[PDB]
Amino acid sequence: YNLICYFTNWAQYRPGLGSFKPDDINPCLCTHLIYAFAGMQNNEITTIEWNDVTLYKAFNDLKNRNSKLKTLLAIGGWNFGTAPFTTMVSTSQNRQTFITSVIKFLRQYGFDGLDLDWEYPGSRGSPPQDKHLFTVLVKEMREAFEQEAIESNRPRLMVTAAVAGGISNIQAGYEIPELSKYLDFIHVMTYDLHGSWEGYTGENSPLYKYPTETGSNAYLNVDYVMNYWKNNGAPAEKLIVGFPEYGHTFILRNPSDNGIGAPTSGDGPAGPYTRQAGFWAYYEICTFLRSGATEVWDASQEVPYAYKANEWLGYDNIKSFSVKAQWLKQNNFGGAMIWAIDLDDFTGSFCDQGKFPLTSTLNKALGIS
Ligand SMILES: CC(=O)N[C@@H]1[C@@H](O)[C@H](O[C@@H]2O[C@H](CO)[C@@H](O)[C@H](O)[C@H]2NC(C)=O)[C@@H](CO)O[C@H]1O
Ligand SMILES: CC(=O)N[C@@H]1[C@@H](O)[C@H](O[C@@H]2O[C@H](CO)[C@@H](O)[C@H](O)[C@H]2NC(C)=O)[C@@H](CO)O[C@H]1O
């Protein structure tokens, strides 16, 4: 099995003990590390942080303590939008400019491949032709990587993609049979499945549907999403299940209504380290739980939730990671990916569960070490 771990190049700016850089990564935890994110300028890949070149070196130097470890550079992300991708794939010339820039960039800085994180072809302003043009991009990149391996006498660069977990986005975005032939791995973002945007409480990454969910609400679980990909053309061995090391926060409209589906208001509270309404890192979750929040096991969906006063949290812990790891193994998937290792209790000083408690759980369950 593979354990793919995202690292974010803005975690360095979090206050105090939230600050995280590649040197804080245990090189033996994962099989693949992915660097989030590169950007794009004039159809070429580029850095986006003043010290990215330094962090690239620190990141790829982790291979000095794990000869099995591979690294990839992710381009895009949620906040990158779509317009630069739409422009880049719109002509063969623009695609060639990009692919050529990617090869030189990855080889120069020590990366083993590229993780395409366009969120998403055919949605969020991207026109309908981008569904097929995304396939064209991936095919041409896969072929260019094969030819560069021949030309440089090195092992081929990998091409992977982070892909939507929402069904309407999947349907608008991906030619799954053809795409799955050319990608090395498919990183399915089976999280952010519920959140304050819905107006009621729900779980970030439930394994199964809630018992009363029907129709499109019954798409919002890991089991449905992964099997959608598998049964619409993707081989299970290439499919990687997404695991969030964060949870989503909600404000209850009435603290006595605190179950799944309870009405909520606003965007949800921010944590002192991540400082973003609506989500908390796992180490921030631990401070909430230790302070006396009521903890509930959502038995039907195999995930925890917790609340205190009018604050409600849908999240994942050691037990839910363990359940979903056993599930993915018994369903013959290729492994797990985590968003993101800097959200684990990497110092071990927030949760009293040791260093990297969530990431270590998957390392053990997937036989990585
Ligand atoms: C592989 C993947 O999950 N990609 C997306 C991530 O971008 C997203 O995380 C968010 O990334 C933004 C930049 O694109 C950051 O500004 C933002 O703080 C961050 N949000 C969180 C909760 O980490 C994750 C998680 O939602 O999933 C995809 O959407
Ligand atoms: C099932 C589904 O499609 N849910 C949507 C959420 O994904 C989405 O949030 C975004 O999810 C991305 C994963 O594909 C993350 O990369 C991204 O960071 C995240 N954005 C936020 C603000 O959390 C929300 C956006 O409103 O809508 C849901 O429909």
Residue numbers in the entry: 22 to 390
Task: Reproduce text from the manuscript describing this model.
Across these different datasets we observed complex ligand density in the active site of mAMCase. While modeling chito-oligomers into strong electron density, we observed strong positive difference density between sugar-binding subsites near the C2 N-acetyl and the C6’ alcohol moieties. When the −1 subsite is at least 50% occupied, Asp138 prefers the active conformation (up towards Glu140).
One of these proteins, Acidic Mammalian Chitinase (AMCase), is an enzyme known for its ability to function under acidic conditions in the stomach but is also active in tissues with more neutral pHs, such as the lung.
